[PDB]
Write a protein that binds this DNA or RNA. Structure first.
Lengths: 18, 4, 4, 309, 306, 312
RNA sequence: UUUAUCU
């Protein structure tokens, strides 16, 4: 897994979690 | 406008 | 404390 | 999710967490509640390095404008002694923006604000003679002063800048990443302040402690040499947790590697500064960008493998 | 949407001429709600220009001081030899005592709400001549260290102003206009959020006496004068305003000058003014975004009579 | 002429955090992850509590204050009845238990345990142990907007120079009795809290080498400060940083021929950036995520709370 | 009608 995907992974993860 |  |  | 953020607050995010991936990241600056003309310049430094065998060479990534990193070599198995001195490695074009004398630093621009700190390490050795390990932790260093009395006629107590959270450097921090040299490593640093503030530029500071000042009198563990005032120099101290990197080179080792630095940074131009032509006002604040920056900064490992930059 | 009246009165003194707005506004609508005191400061004064000389004026975030003016020969910029004198808003002496070591008694810290300045020409059609141009320099207050050879030898530090340099040459973007059309201008916050700046003791001149100007790095000197008459209290987070004013020699240039900035201070319990102070107004998100938006919106300066 | 062309469910940490600010030390409230700081950085919070039982020299108005400075619980100054502080009188440090462990013995090595500390709350309490007819006098309190500044001046020397050092401002509002205060019969004791001085919870850097203030070799006249500060032995105590907190001011008038004996509690929650090397570094957790409910509550409570309250 | 993004 690349870096922009360890980044965009916690983005749709924290933005979806709420 | 700019005054209110 | 804890009024409102 | 990603369709919620403003477009300026995105080039800002790429410049912050994943600068390596998009070959070009001008960025639109920080979506801060504050909008004013400012210039967003991203720094990139490429450096090929050879490590002294039998010696742990230490590296420092501090939020100092114009200079990407500091280094010193110390015998293996040991940490920096008070006698050890560090040297800087400017970012391409340092001379251009901060003049030649410590008295010229401020003319190019007045203040700065750090966006990101990005570091890369790429093993450039053969798999047969490479040996050793890379260790990393982040140190919360801040810049401040210390006043001590001096006997002159009449006697007075001069007060000067000193650095705190320094000694944290000697021991391998609890929160760290450790791995075999060959895998190399990438990592970044986030703002250590609740809000992003503008730190002013500092003049006349070639080295710390400054001349005529005895070390330890500062309480600081070691010395920082900017060197010639014309060659290099120290401008300011960003609110960024400085990153620390140790490289253990077991004796008889053949360890070399390429190094890359991504410092997304914003300054404010002076009208006489010819650079002012490309200044674009700080993009309007975008609430989610600020949530994401904070959120992801907190979710990221201290460091990661080189192959996974 | 709808905002509160304290966050509106604040918007008004900051962006409405001092003709329309009479009240300074209970305070700045921010997180902070501790005991503060707002005082809108207005300096009214008529002045005539030295003929044949180009006079430069600066509106700096220095409390109790309207501006700093000095004159240089036509078409030339400030040189190491030139120095600026400040003009005090009324009753300055009244709150910053008489000596530099007496600035802290009345109040302990501050921050600027807005900083506005204007010019209404008096000259008649046949006598007036020249131009007035304007740009804003992002000036900050820094500190500079250097070695000193005494026995024993040591390295002392001294306050210095950075961004000082931008003043020599006119800004890439500016308000260039005929002296007869006058001008109105304003300065806004230089930081994302509003922070309190402590008061400054013992500062009268910069570079301070006993300090070579070369070592300081700044282009020109600044003298407050006698501790009694004036003084340098503090340096707010606000871009500074620069203004050149060409005065052709065969000419008569008369004009009125208004300069008012609303501002907030932290009264000292002892202080004889502590009683007027009210608590800082509650947070107002609508007004903050509007303050920032109108800031980016307004031009460098506008023609007078507008 | 041609015209020119110009081109109700606040996160649990703000539940434990808000309780740090206005909840007594008997509630045994915990420090919590920290402040709902926008910042998520690594920090270790600590609740400092100090109990001091003391007697008051009668006929002497003892003036005490709470220091926004870490490591010291309060400062004590004493003077004749009806009199105020003077250029002659100096204040004595009275550090929190275990001070020496975090700042070491030398004034220069104050920095190593931690780089910077940000204040959470600052509270103080007084309880009287005096019987009914043996006690006398009154207590009076007001808060002060004391900030750490710096003064610049030139002292002739060859070569001549302008050395400048730290000087505290707002000490002038320390002599006269504040307009907004709480005054009561010594016996009724008193309780009080302090709020954040600024809207931002920025980290105040830790300083070194400051033992006395005005620092040595400097006239108290050339500093502007009303009186002196005893750093005390450098190894016993020192002042590292100045918190952006309103400083509290309490004085107790001891009329002649009266014995006043009462205990004293002082606590405060703080967050510090742990040194990588430090032992303390291993307890540290992250500054809890930014919560808007608690951040606005902390401020609404500051304006609602009276200057001081009865002991009971 | 023309020349930096998101699935």
């Amino acid at each position: 897994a690349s870096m922009w995907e360890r980044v965009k992974s916690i983005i749709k993860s924290s933005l979806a979690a709420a | 406008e700019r005054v209110k | 404390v804890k009024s409102i | 999710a990603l369709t919620r953020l403003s477009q300026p607050g995105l080039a800002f995010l790429k410049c912050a967490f994943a600068p390596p991936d998009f070959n070009t990241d001008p960025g639109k600056g920080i979506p801060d509640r504050f909008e004013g003309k400012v210039v967003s310049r991203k720094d990139v430094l490429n450096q090929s390095i050879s490590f002294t065998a039998g010696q742990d060479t230490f590296i420092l990534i501090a939020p100092t404008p114009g200079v990407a990193y500091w280094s010193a070599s110390v015998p293996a198995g040991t940490f920096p002694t008070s006698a050890t001195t560090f040297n800087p490695v400017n970012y391409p074009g340092f001379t251009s923006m901060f003049g030649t004398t410590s008295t010229s630093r401020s003319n190019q621009v007045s203040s700065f604000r750090y966006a990101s700190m990005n570091v890369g390490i790429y093993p450039t050795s053969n798999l047969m003679q490479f040996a050793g390990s890379i260790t990393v932790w982040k140190c919360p260093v801040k810049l401040s002063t210390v006043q001590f009395p001096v006997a002159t006629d009449p006697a007075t107590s001069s007060l000067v800048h000193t650095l705190v959270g320094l000694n944290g450097v000697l021991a391998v921090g609890p929160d760290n990443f450790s791995e075999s040299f060959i895998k190399g490593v990438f990592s970044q640093s986030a703002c250590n302040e609740p809000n992003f503030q503008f730190n002013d530029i500092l003049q006349g500071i070639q080295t710390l402690p400054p001349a005529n000042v005895s070390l330890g009198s500062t309480g600081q563990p070691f010395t920082m040499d900017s060197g010639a005032e014309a060659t290099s120099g120290v401008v300011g101290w960003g609110n960024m947790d400085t990153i620390v990197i140790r490289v253990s080179a077991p004796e008889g080792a053949v360890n070399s590697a390429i190094l890359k630095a991504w410092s997304c940074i914003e300054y404010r131009p002076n009208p006489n500064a010819m650079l002012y032509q490309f200044g674009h006002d700080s993009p309007p604040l975008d609430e989610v960008a600020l949530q994401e920056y904070r959120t992801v900064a907190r979710s990221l490992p201290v460091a990661v493998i080189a192959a996974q930059n």
